[PDB]
Predict the structure of Putative metal uptake regulation protein.
Amino acid sequence: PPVKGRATRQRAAVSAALQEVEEFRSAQELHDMLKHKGDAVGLTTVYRTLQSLADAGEVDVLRTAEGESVYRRCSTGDHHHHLVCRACGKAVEVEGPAVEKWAEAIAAEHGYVNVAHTVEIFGTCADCAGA
DNA sequence: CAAGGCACATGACAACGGTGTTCAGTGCCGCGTTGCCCGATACCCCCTACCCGTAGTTGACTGGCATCCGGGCGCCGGGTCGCC
Ligand SMILES: [Zn+2]
Ligand SMILES: [Zn+2]
Ligand SMILES: [Zn+2]
């Protein structure tokens, strides 16, 4: 996980933690679990590094209904969209050219030069209903 | 003269006002800690220059050295050969 800044142990640690975790996580709870591992990193430095990763793009970032920015890495680097369970957090990556073609058709119809598409579908998970 | 009808105001009724808290997150901006990058520095190599130890050198050449006295002074102590 190369970073723009000079490599070191702490960014390697947070990158490894993101690698192991395959769920949407917020910065403060990420720091909580990171401290639980025992690295004892600083909150603002964690903020700096995760902002850098979000800028780099290898970690997808979503915004919750409360307004929180939640980050997680995707195995595949191609652009896609994530289906997430609010109760459990199971993030599954799917992509379809139909939505993209729809976006380009709308942009051309309205004469838009460039566009940015953001699509997240929220829904109720299958296993949580069962007890 | 008493009973029945209309005005204004009134006991509650929430919802705005405005401002104060609270979450909580994410930075903002001053204190300290970190990967680089090089640069010099100790430490392997090769070469030869020079220090230092060993071993020969065949006419003959076969016993030295200069001592030491003007203490001085007395005693101890033992040795040492005469003594009868
Ligand atoms: Zn993604
Ligand atoms: Zn898309
Ligand atoms: Zn679920």
